[PDB]
Symmetry: C3
Subunit: 252 residues, 3 copies
């Protein structure tokens, strides 16, 4: 890959954005490579969790503007610009965004696509898209609002102001804030814990949670209960519960 770095430690895949000269600005190539890698990581039975991170300076500053600069409606509708990012949301195993420094525009949206979001105390989030005469194109208006409320999302998206790690955390945007130097350590310790869970259980858990955004509460409750019933058809449930009863450790 030209624009990213991928490594595997045990059951944790790690995708690192790698365009240091452009503060990891997202672009068509990053979109394709990150999705390709995660997809591949998703299909690997030896991987139980996936981390997406950038540099200590930048998770990702935003999309690459030169690419977008000369697109007509026609070009956009035709390529279905940005659509391919959807592939990341379709990944079945848990994804963890480890965010340091700038996560702006596409960058912030990328991080919101992940399931779990760990932020360095230096993290900075934003949706400055409106400054360019456009608006978020990667789910920002949708996922931000749902995380932090209309008042704050409207503020960020209409002004372009940034939000610091502490505000993000108390607002609903991130799971946890840690010291910038521990980011990758915590993120990996977190991915480790998750990849160590039953693979089927974690994939069901994650799917269940995602349901909370796609229907009414009554339907989400029903979905979850049926998925819950299903878990009892898996070997992992039987072992997981026997181990607890036998005050021992679960071996999946």
């Amino acid at each position: 890959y030209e624009t990213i770095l991928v490594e595997r430690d045990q059951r944790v895949g790690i995708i690192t954005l790698n365009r240091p000269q452009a503060l990891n600005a997202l672009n068509s190539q990053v979109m394709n490579e990150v999705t390709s890698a995660a997809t591949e990581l998703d299909d690997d039975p030896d991987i139980g969790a996936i981390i997406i991170t950038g540099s200590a300076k930048a998770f990702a500053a935003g999309a690459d503007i030169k690419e977008m600069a000369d697109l007509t409606f026609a070009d956009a509708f035709t390529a279905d610009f940005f659509a391919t990012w959807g592939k990341l949301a379709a990944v079945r195993t848990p994804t963890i965004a480890a965010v340091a420094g700038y996560a702006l525009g596409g960058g912030c949206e990328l991080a919101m696509m992940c399931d779990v979001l760990i932020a360095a105390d230096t993290a900075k989030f934003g949706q400055p898209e409106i400054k360019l005469g456009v608006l978020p194109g990667m789910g920002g208006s949708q996922r931000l609002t749902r995380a932090i409320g209309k008042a704050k999302a409207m503020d960020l998206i209409l002004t372009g102001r940034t939000m610091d790690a502490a505000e993000a955390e108390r607002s609903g945007l991130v799971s946890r804030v840690v010291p910038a130097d521990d980011l990758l350590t915590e993120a990996r310790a977190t991915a480790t814990t998750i990849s160590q869970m039953s693979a089927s259980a974690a994939r069901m858990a994650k799917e269940a949670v995602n349901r909370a955004f796609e229907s009414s509460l009554s339907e989400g409750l029903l979905y979850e209960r049926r998925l819950f019933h299903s878990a009892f058809a898996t070997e992992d449930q039987s072992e997981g519960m026997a181990a607890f009863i036998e005050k021992r450790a679960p071996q999946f």
Copy 2:
């Protein structure tokens, strides 16, 4: 009379206390059935306008009885519709207050989230350890938790099994208020008293309107609320409430 809980009327407030100290009020089929019976009775009782549910100062409810689940098959689960009876609590029309102290994990965390109002003690620890056991939340955890505290944190909690303290739950949307542990039970009564002294029908309608926010688009929720608001004038309690306020005194609905 019940085996695993204690029910107690205090004027207009019903108080359901999980009584299974040896197991940390761990939920099980019999608690499911007794709590939902008790709450249903209270709900139908005209003399009761608010319902509290609580455990011990050490544990609201620390998970469920795993033995009842260990040997389940999919066919057992589907046929029994395991856990469906809990939906009975959510069907209760009278307002319900979960007074949570200490451990509220797995089904306990989910039982607290089923209530309308959540008062937590200093000591409260919330969590969804289900993943650890090779299953997932089955009493609405994935649904109610995510809607209160947002995707990032729900995913964190549900995938890792990490606990969340009182202070974090308040800052993220899980609980209404945090009070000192020695005061929780006392604070919960006061809140319940306040509610039970509102118009019963107005209170039931208020709670119904808020629940709509999770079942449809905003535009539909708004239309529903508005038609419900209209119907509130078709009551006399509105007259009393107006007169009491004008006369700068307490209403007697």
Copy 3:
């Protein structure tokens, strides 16, 4: 001529000030009609890119006014159909209808004296201006239930950490800060801001999958506008955008 409000125009910013401190800016039928009429004109005025709604330093609006067929309160829905961005600058009391009116706005800037609540229930009534919906979606069920069922108030700091408000500022600065936020917003591309606002509103009206699709189509549409072209050119060429 407005009898219950003051309407000002500073560059591209429209400012509606509720003006009946005799009742602490309580909202009667007349306030409803005048604010909505004002917001609607400002919306249709091309020289306005942002609209602020504020009360007095003591009360944004202390409440509604006590005293099927008529579809009562339905004219408020007309504030929600305003296309231009709207900012509520809330000082002191925003209770009942006041709190609801502030929630109808896109951006909510509160003074540290701000007090929010829905005391309806104590008069044996219910929120009728969207408070059971917008509040619950802002701050979650446990707090929406608490406020709506007990009538208790919520101070600025709780509103801020809960998701009710965008930001909190000192009471002396509230008006300046809100004007500055409005100025920034009104200096954006008008079409972009209108699209941005409409995109964010979609998040309460359908599933995530449909919201994402809607946003992406709006985004694509933005490339048919001069402003995306100018906004993007001005970035690459490291200068100030001149929006038309």
